[PDB]
Design a protein around this ligand. Sequence first.
Ligand SMILES: O=C(N[C@@H]1c2cccc(O)c2C[C@@H]1C(=O)O)c1ccc(Nn2ccnc2)cc1
Length: 167
Amino acid sequence: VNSFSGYLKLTDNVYIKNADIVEEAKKVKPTVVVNAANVYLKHGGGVAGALNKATNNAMQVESDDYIATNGPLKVGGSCVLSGHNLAKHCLHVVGPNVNKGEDIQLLKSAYENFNQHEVLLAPLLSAGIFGADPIHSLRVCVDTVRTNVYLAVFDKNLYDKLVSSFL
Ligand SMILES: O=C(N[C@@H]1c2cccc(O)c2C[C@@H]1C(=O)O)c1ccc(Nn2ccnc2)cc1
């Protein structure tokens, strides 16, 4: 038993809720919150800009040092950094960005990063301003992630559609 509240059970291990992921993180203080990152860890908008704003830009400062030392991530890759005031850790995961013309197939590789963590609070990878179909992202999530994932979906109308169309 954990502290996530009001989630809907989709499968044995995947749960979903209409909520702002930053607000969920503040309340639950999960061990791991997932960021919808890009390879440069430039957190300007969407989930990434949201999480970074809530950290008062500390996430961006830490990320800039990470990139200066290690260089960019790979599309489909990830790194673990601090969760600051939101979580113990932030797993920065890079899903493909269709609006950048990136390869849709890398979405499964991106979700495989979640399997390294027993429990995560996460967004749907490649959705929103990354350009992919959220219904597809949810399908790849359920078919790839074996650990316990609590998905926060910002948009109410999208949430309702994700639940109603889930196979
Ligand atoms: O971009 C966000 N989310 C994504 C989104 C939005 C629309 C359609 C989608 O498919 C997706 C995928 C993901 C989701 O499902 O939420 C987001 C932005 C700000 C925020 N917090 N915030 C607001 C103002 N200041 C801070 C929280 C989330």
